[PDB]
Amino acid sequence: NPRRLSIIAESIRDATWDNWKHVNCDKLTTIIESSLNVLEPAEYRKMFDRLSVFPPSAHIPTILLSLISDVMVVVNKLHKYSLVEKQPSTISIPSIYLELKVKLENEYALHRSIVDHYNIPKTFDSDDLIPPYLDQYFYSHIGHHLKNIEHPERMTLFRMVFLDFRFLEQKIRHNTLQQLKFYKPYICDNDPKYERLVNAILDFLPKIYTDLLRIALMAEDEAIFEEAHKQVQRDNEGRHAVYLHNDFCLIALASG
Amino acid sequence: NPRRLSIIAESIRDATWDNWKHVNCDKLTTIIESSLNVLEPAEYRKMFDRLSVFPPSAHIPTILLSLISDVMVVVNKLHKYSLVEKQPSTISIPSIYLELKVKLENEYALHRSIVDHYNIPKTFDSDDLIPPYLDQYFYSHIGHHLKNIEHPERMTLFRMVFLDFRFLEQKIRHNTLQQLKFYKPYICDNDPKYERLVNAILDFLPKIYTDLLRIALMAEDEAIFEEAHKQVQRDNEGRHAVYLHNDFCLIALASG
């Protein structure tokens, strides 16, 4: 937006990166909070502060905010102001409102939120490894929250040691790098056995019903086949995001 | 009207079912009451609240309105305002104000109202099993009131054991269709021994003075013949719809 660019440019002359992200946390936050001041604080601001846990680029279902027609009427009026855009039927937030104001101001509800960010995903456990995930939230945003809560859920709920979530993520998303972005920045104290085992998994992961279990059989060195057994019991690079009508291709000299 | 339609569409666009009947409990109930603010609670609103005991869309007799001529002029001026249309002398109620206006707001006058709603039919009892039911109200309301009060009065005045209701309702409605709607859900208050007998007679009911006696004679395991003996002491589906004549007809392909 023009005002953010103008204020950032003016701040830079009096650093291109310090004033770009660090400074102006007390000038821009002033005007955006002045705009915020229109809302009734008791009911609205608290619900807004509940929303800090979401990824900066994220869409929000109604049940999650309900945990954290009253809720839908409330979000309706907050949208009516200019603070929460609803679409048919996830809901998202303006970033200019998202990553600046509530980023600065927050209580320790994060834990009460984040355990709820474990409470409902734990309920989303099915007989098989087919849980009713949400396409954008349960597939993507779950990694942040599961890393936020604790370690042991990392070796179970992200199903990296499992196999089904791979199929779910791949088939529902079209696509792969967006998983790697969650495969690398998600390696915490998950012990030597997994630190390294999931790294061996990740080395193979970019290299590509019965097909998935058969290919898991090859990685016998990893426990992937170990649970592929229970599942059956119960081209280096390829682009498909462009579907059809393509002619020619070529590659950067500088390997870029 | 183009007020409830407009507000319901607004609420739905801002769930087609929650906003249909469940939501708007604060915005369809304010307006449905704000319009009624021109009245007084001493005489009008009190009896109007008492009238909530009646079905969502049905009638009200003069005498039963009396026990729950002053009432007559009261409902006359209420008709004048806009509360209770008076017709020749059955009287019916608007469904909007009976249903969405007074359902949420109700004081515990139901006990006296329903005990009176039992007392009047008990007074409306004869030596034989011919009670002085009014044409429409009593036939369509004694079942509800009996289910409201207790099971033995249902056992008596439903006349599942007696045979006279089977004649009176069928020959005063033309049909037994609504008699089946009485029998099917009104099972709760009795005893399961009576309930299985009512199940058997309910199964017998859609299949079909002295003729009724002969029909009841065939059913020997039920008390209907047992009472039919005192009454005399003291086929397949048939519609009969258009009163002039009928030319052609057919059944839907999907049995629908």
First to last CA, chain A: 31
Gap from A85 CA to chain B (nearest CA, Å):
12
Method of elucidation: cryo-EM
Q: Which two tokens stand for residue A193?
A: 């056995």
Q: What residue of A is the nearest CA neighbor of B11?
A: A73
Q: Find the CB nearest A76 among B14, B18, B22.
A: B14
Q: What residue of B is the nearest CA neighbor of A73?
A: B14
Q: What's the CA gap between A8 and A17, in Å, rounded?
A: 10
At residue B104, the 3 state secondary structure works out as coil
At residue A59, the 3 state secondary structure works out as strand
Phi, then psi, of B86 in degrees rounded to 5: -110, 130
Q: Is B15 on the interface with A (CB under 8 A)?
A: yes
Interface probe for B, chosen from A62, A73, A89 (most Cβ of B below 10 Å), is A73
How many residues can be counted in chain B? 256
Residues of chain B contacting residue A69, judged by C-beta atoms under 8 Å apart: 15, 18-19, 22-23
Gap from B102 CA to chain A (nearest CA, Å):
20
Could you tell me the resolution of this structure in angstroms? 7.0
Whether residue A138 contacts residue A102, with contact meaning beta carbons closer than 8 Å, is answered with: no
Q: Which two tokens stand for residue B5?
A: 């339609």
Whether residue B158 contacts residue B145, with contact meaning beta carbons closer than 8 Å, is answered with: no
Which one-letter DSSP state was computed for residue B59?
E
Gap from A113 CA to chain B (nearest CA, Å):
27
Gap from A126 CA to chain B (nearest CA, Å):
28
CA atoms within 13 A on the CB side of A116: 15
Q: Which residues 19-48 in chain B show a CB within 8 A of chain A?
A: 19, 22-23
- Integer Rg of chain B from CA: 22
Q: What's the CA gap between A222 and A114, in Å, rounded?
A: 31
CB atoms within 10 A of CB A69: 15
Residues 6+ apart with CB under 8 A from A62: A71, A72, A75, A89, A91
Q: Which two tokens stand for residue B36?
A: 């009624």
Residues 6+ apart with CB under 8 A from B25: B104
Helices (H) and strands (E) counted in chain B, each on its own, are 14, 2
Q: Which residues 57-96 in chain A show a CB within 8 A of chain B?
A: 69, 72-73, 76
Residues of chain B contacting residue A73, judged by C-beta atoms under 8 Å apart: 23
Alpha helices in chain A (DSSP H): 2-13, 28-36, 46-49, 62-67, 70-81, 95-98, 101-104, 109-123, 142-149, 164-172, 177-183, 191-204, 210-218, 224-233
Q: Which two tokens stand for residue B90?
A: 């059955």
CA angle B216, B219, B222 (to 5 degrees): 100
Residues of chain A contacting residue B14, judged by C-beta atoms under 8 Å apart: 76
Q: Is B10 on the interface with A (CB under 8 A)?
A: no
Q: Is B135 on the interface with A (CB under 8 A)?
A: no
Query: Which H or E run contains B92?
Result: strand B91-92
At residue B131, the 3 state secondary structure works out as coil
Contacts for B129-137 with beta carbons within 8 Å, 24 or more apart? Answer: B129/B159, B129/B162, B129/B163, B129/B164, B129/B165, B129/B227, B129/B231, B130/B164, B130/B168, B131/B157, B133/B168, B133/B172, B134/B61, B134/B90, B135/B90, B135/B172, B136/B59, B136/B90, B137/B58, B137/B59, B137/B60, B137/B61, B137/B64, B137/B90
Q: Is B14 on the interface with A (CB under 8 A)?
A: yes
What is the DSSP secondary-structure string of A86-147?
E----EE--HHHHTTHHHHS--THHHHHHHHHHHHHHH---SSS-----TTIIIIIHHHHHH
Residues 6+ apart with CB under 8 A from A129: A159, A162, A163, A164, A165, A231
Cβ pair A72:B15 closer than 8 A: yes
Interface probe for A, chosen from B12, B13, B14 (most Cβ of A below 10 Å), is B14
Q: What's the CA gap between B93 and B91, in Å, rounded?
A: 7
Q: What's the CA gap between A177 and A169, in Å, rounded?
A: 12
Whether residue B50 contacts residue B113, with contact meaning beta carbons closer than 8 Å, is answered with: yes
Q: What's the CA gap between B158 and B165, in Å, rounded?
A: 7
Query: Which H or E run contains A85?
Result: strand A85-86
Gap from B73 CA to chain A (nearest CA, Å):
42
Q: What's the CA gap between B144 and B137, in Å, rounded?
A: 11
Cβ pair A69:B18 closer than 8 A: yes
* Beta-bridge mates of residue A188: none
